[PDB]
Amino acid sequence: VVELYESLTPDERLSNSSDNFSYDPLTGHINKPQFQTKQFIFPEIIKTMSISKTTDDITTKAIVMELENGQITYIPKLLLNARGKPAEEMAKDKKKEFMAT
């Protein structure tokens, strides 16, 4: 899983000037991303994947997988957390999140 942010410093809009700019993507003037990545191990062979939809995309996205057996299992995106810590450094880390997984 890779997650894309405009800038990793905790409070910054390095770009994405939103007032009147009227971006032009075909020139190539757009802002470029920064990213954070993690890897996880799963027991069973995943044949295919999708992400669920709702009327307003508020609830967690629930990555849904079809395995080789034909069994179908989903996991919420909250479990696949980039920027995670090993749960030793999550204790009394005020900076982390609300309910940091």
Partner: protein, 140 residues
């Protein structure tokens, strides 16, 4: 074919050929209001199609194959090749996905101590995987 869906059994109201009678590989729906479709025939030939009313503002398209990602521009009711990202002789693209449009609820993820990271939201992105033998690597 054009089919009228009714509460009762439907009726097949029209059948007709395309302009060019070749085998059809895939169809992409273009802008809703203009009622356009881009049809990719096997032999890899693209046909712009404007069926009926249903009774610069560039348009950009993106096609992918096992050989690479191609991209096209639709201007003046014609299709034009714009760029190419083709893999080597021993590489083969395996997975590809587009950015689904999503309703925007919150503009940034907020931290404890109430600072916000301003997640990256640029709509015209695609992701893909290249599987390479002769190094045994997977590139994203």
């Amino acid at each position: 074919l054009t089919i009228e869906v009714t509460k009762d059994q439907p009726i097949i109201k029209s059948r007709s050929p395309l302009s060019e009678r070749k085998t059809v590989d895939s169809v992409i729906r273009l802008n809703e209001h203009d009622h356009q479709y881009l049809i990719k025939f096997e032999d890899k030939d693209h046909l712009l199609f404007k069926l009926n009313p249903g009774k610069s503002s560039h348009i950009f398209v993106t096609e992918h194959d096992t050989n690479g990602i191609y991209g096209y521009i639709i201007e003046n009711d014609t299709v034009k090749q714009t760029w190419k990202k083709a893999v080597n002789s021993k590489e083969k693209m395996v997975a590809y996905s587009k950015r689904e449009t999503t309703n925007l609820n919150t503009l940034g993820i907020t931290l404890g101590d109430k600072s916000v990271l301003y997640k990256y939201l640029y709509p015209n992105l695609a992701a893909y995987l290249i599987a390479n033998e002769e190094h045994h690597t997977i590139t994203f």
